[PDB]
Design a protein around this ligand. Sequence first.
Ligand SMILES: NC(=O)c1ccc[n+]([C@@H]2O[C@H](COP(=O)([O-])OP(=O)(O)OC[C@H]3O[C@@H](n4cnc5c(N)ncnc54)[C@H](O)[C@@H]3O)[C@@H](O)[C@H]2O)c1
Ligand SMILES: NC(=O)c1ccc[n+]([C@@H]2O[C@H](COP(=O)([O-])OP(=O)(O)OC[C@H]3O[C@@H](n4cnc5c(N)ncnc54)[C@H](O)[C@@H]3O)[C@@H](O)[C@H]2O)c1
Ligand SMILES: NC(=O)c1ccc[n+]([C@@H]2O[C@H](COP(=O)([O-])OP(=O)(O)OC[C@H]3O[C@@H](n4cnc5c(N)ncnc54)[C@H](O)[C@@H]3O)[C@@H](O)[C@H]2O)c1
Ligand SMILES: NC(=O)c1ccc[n+]([C@@H]2O[C@H](COP(=O)([O-])OP(=O)(O)OC[C@H]3O[C@@H](n4cnc5c(N)ncnc54)[C@H](O)[C@@H]3O)[C@@H](O)[C@H]2O)c1
Lengths: 253, 253, 253, 253
Amino acid sequence: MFNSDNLRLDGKCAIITGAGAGIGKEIAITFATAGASVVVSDINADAANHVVDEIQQLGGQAFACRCDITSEQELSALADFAISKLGKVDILVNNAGGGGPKPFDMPMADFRRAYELNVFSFFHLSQLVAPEMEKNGGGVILTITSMAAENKNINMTSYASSKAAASHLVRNMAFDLGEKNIRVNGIAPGAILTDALKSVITPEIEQKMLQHTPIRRLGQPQDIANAALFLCSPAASWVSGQILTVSGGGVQE
Amino acid sequence: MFNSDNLRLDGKCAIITGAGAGIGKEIAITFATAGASVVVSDINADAANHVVDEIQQLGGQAFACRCDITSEQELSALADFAISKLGKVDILVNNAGGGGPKPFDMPMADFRRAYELNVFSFFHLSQLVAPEMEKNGGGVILTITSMAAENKNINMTSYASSKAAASHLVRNMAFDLGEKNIRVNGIAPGAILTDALKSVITPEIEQKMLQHTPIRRLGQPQDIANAALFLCSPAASWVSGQILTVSGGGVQE
Amino acid sequence: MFNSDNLRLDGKCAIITGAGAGIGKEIAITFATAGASVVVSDINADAANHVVDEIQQLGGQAFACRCDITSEQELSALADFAISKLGKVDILVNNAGGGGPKPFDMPMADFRRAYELNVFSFFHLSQLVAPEMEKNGGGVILTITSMAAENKNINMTSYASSKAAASHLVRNMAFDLGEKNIRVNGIAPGAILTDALKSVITPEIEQKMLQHTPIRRLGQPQDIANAALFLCSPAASWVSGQILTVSGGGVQE
Amino acid sequence: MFNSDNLRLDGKCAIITGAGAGIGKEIAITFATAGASVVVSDINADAANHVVDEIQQLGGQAFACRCDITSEQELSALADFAISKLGKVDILVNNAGGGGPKPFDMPMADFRRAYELNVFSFFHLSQLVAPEMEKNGGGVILTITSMAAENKNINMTSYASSKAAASHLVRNMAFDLGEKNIRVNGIAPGAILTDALKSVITPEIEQKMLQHTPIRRLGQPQDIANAALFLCSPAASWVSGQILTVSGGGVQE
Ligand SMILES: NC(=O)c1ccc[n+]([C@@H]2O[C@H](COP(=O)([O-])OP(=O)(O)OC[C@H]3O[C@@H](n4cnc5c(N)ncnc54)[C@H](O)[C@@H]3O)[C@@H](O)[C@H]2O)c1
Ligand SMILES: NC(=O)c1ccc[n+]([C@@H]2O[C@H](COP(=O)([O-])OP(=O)(O)OC[C@H]3O[C@@H](n4cnc5c(N)ncnc54)[C@H](O)[C@@H]3O)[C@@H](O)[C@H]2O)c1
Ligand SMILES: NC(=O)c1ccc[n+]([C@@H]2O[C@H](COP(=O)([O-])OP(=O)(O)OC[C@H]3O[C@@H](n4cnc5c(N)ncnc54)[C@H](O)[C@@H]3O)[C@@H](O)[C@H]2O)c1
Ligand SMILES: NC(=O)c1ccc[n+]([C@@H]2O[C@H](COP(=O)([O-])OP(=O)(O)OC[C@H]3O[C@@H](n4cnc5c(N)ncnc54)[C@H](O)[C@@H]3O)[C@@H](O)[C@H]2O)c1
């Protein structure tokens, strides 16, 4: 039978990478509003700090930490800081990442970078928290991937190849971590109208993207926040190694 | 921000196939307990009625109809009964259907039958309830597919191909019905310990299926009911054409 | 090292369903030209018969047989006739099939039909030849599926769902038949400019379809004939359970 | 109509990574024997040179270069040597690369390295030879990926994710290079019995891997060389962005 408390994160401690803005910001707020203590990580400290007061204005407890996910040194620091501020780590939502469409002849530096963001940082950070989660008898890791991980188009070599790596790592990491009773899942956002896109997108552009979405509307960060909550909640206790695409049933071009 | 009402089905009217036992019974009870009025359908009216009684005891509203999904006549009869008893239809949970390991040399009757159970039935009923969902302004159709739809093995020709047909039906159907604000999704459950297997299973046999499952415990009907709720709740309003697997990150032989 | 005879069908006997025209016609000719005796099956006898003289004009030996693949009675007849005319059956290429885009509210008859063509006939015919192939110690089954089996778009419910069933049957049948030392593979044609499309397609239409194909050109039946030869040849002796998409790297819309 | 010349590489110039042994060596010999001039590259010049000698003995033209694919400098040096010795480049067979089972707690050095071996190397070399292929009017790049790219298991985080990255690189890269008439494909080989394993394997161990393979025999290097030939031969001129698995229809543990 239905049980609302299974849909909440009461007493949980979560790290949310790149949560100073966009989808990441919504996950942080939505998680704190469901009962979990949160460490809001982001390179843009001022942004991270805004999210924190914003959570307190709601009564949740958040802490800010600047952290370049691409710096191994900052990742271990993020981890030590999180275990000190919250006392433990139950949830890790690896949101930060990116890269973008690029020509085939981008310098290798551009190529290597997508991996730092989408693959290596994600993997190093899990290695850091995994021991903590295993100490407490379990935990949940959630990464935000992308639909590029499953589509193919021009100028997507690095971004698409990296996101694919991350999605497949999820499927395998689910096995290594499963022993430590840690679930690992991912979510592939469609065209999320994060405030950034929201500012540029022309009503003509919108129609062009929504041209192939059955549920004719652009996504909102919340859509991704709802999916994350479910996947990180106890209601999803036997769900591991999955990638949930949240994109209205189609693809935005 | 976290909104608990988005995770409830207040005033939603759901039809649920094969709800006398196992997975369907639990989705019926979880749904009804989350605020929706439900029609419990089943080839076993005794079972359906018991489930209805039990739902009412918990203070939920529910109605029972003995329906054999392999009958076109009986499928229309199910739709009329729901229109008649609930007044409208917002959610269809196509749970019944089946088939299992069959010799390559099985009689064609047996082969086609797996299609009756998982494909033709599911599609027709969708045709029946679609027109009713659109007049309410939207809806959610959800199927209980299978991991056989994604796996490969011996003695699975009928069973696995039909579940594969059903799973790709979800993806395509999401396009057609997307213009009528209807979302279509499915769930691929692993080895779920339903009251039947619960007594056919022996602790020995168990350590074998679980041999390749990261989250080392067999599934409970609640796990599936939990994902169906989310997938049919307004919180997953931009999730369509997806097939979520709940198997603890592995495959139970 | 390279060995041309491994790329030929010398001494092989092949059944080619729906070979009176299109892709099917090319497979027949290309196979006979590589050394195999062929039974050219098709509902349009005159077409089947043309292909046969055409093969003889090249020195290959073909035999015609009218056969509605959707009639169980005609399938067993096709089989008995093939084993009588050729002496044995080494290769089965299940080309005939079809169905097409259809609205969600097509009558059920339309839905059931796609399955007769794409799934049931294919499965019944394999059941019929499998015993013959097993007698000779091996064989090869090849089905022509479609890209609909992997894409999702509006008005594709039946066609797409059926082709998906067929592709997944390939993956599983590979296990049942593997014991009988029979390989089973499929090929998913992209937009093949079969003489039919070739007659209607406007130079403007062409551009529209080729809009998303990296190798900017429409396919030719031969392209599919080359793939089939490889997959049915000894060079592909450890290749089973595969679906090869031949579509220039993209999709034609 | 069957055309044997389409299945040959006469006057084609191919570069082949890790061609001193196993799979690469055989693709080198099969290619050279099918009419193309080949550059045999390898971190082991002794091995490369022996393979070159052996090729010449069979009357084919070949050249050897000791190249360590993990070096950007050495990759450019390989491209110059091929341009210098063969005059042009029409085919690139990226065979080397690797990595294997690694503990979740592996050092990041080991993790990144799997990316050096299967991702970064493969991409860069593609960048190097692309410009040369387009000036000849076309080309074919082909990678030796892995079944780990599609599977899930314990102790495969690095190995499997990098092969997944490489496999999705094929799909996307096919778009970019498609405008320059360059086709990109890959092959996922199963358990191939190469001269090394050939002596490390014990008849006991063999009956175990083969336990779930329909075509019950381990793969031979020829099987892979056979598919690479076809995939690089003009006969597969409309096949791009594909990843063919050669594993006898199953998975060898
Ligand atoms: N918005 C979309 O439409 C969309 C679609 C598909 C996938 N995604 C994925 O979702 C994730 C988040 O995307 P978003 O759209 O919210 O992005 P965004 O760039 O708007 O926000 C990223 C947040 O992370 C911060 N950040 C950037 N680099 C960082 C670093 N190196 N270390 C720590 N923090 C850093 C930014 O300041 C920002 O607050 C990414 O992994 C992205 O690949 C987004
Ligand atoms: N339980 C598992 O481990 C598992 C795993 C994978 C897929 N599934 C899927 O879940 C669904 C239910 O499986 P389950 O094991 O919970 O089922 P079950 O055998 O318990 O059947 C559930 C209910 O359906 C009823 N029913 C059977 N045939 C019917 C018909 N023809 N018309 C109407 N009602 C009918 C049964 O009497 C029962 O009350 C199926 O779609 C099955 O493929 C279950
Ligand atoms: N042409 C394309 O672009 C394309 C694309 C994707 C998939 N396909 C698939 O390829 C296969 C063959 O397609 P095609 O394009 O050559 O088709 P087609 O309709 O041009 O030719 C089919 C041939 O089979 C015959 N046929 C029709 N029904 C038959 C039946 N019931 N029994 C026996 N023979 C019958 C027809 O007379 C004809 O000679 C089909 O399974 C189709 O789904 C084709
Ligand atoms: N053999 C199998 O069962 C199998 C299965 C799956 C994938 N593969 C793939 O096939 C490819 C070759 O595998 P294999 O077992 O045949 O390989 P292998 O270990 O025999 O290596 C082949 C050649 O590559 C050379 N080489 C190694 N590192 C190199 C480097 N850094 N730079 C240049 N040359 C180098 C080796 O010395 C050897 O001569 C790899 O991509 C591997 O992932 C093989």
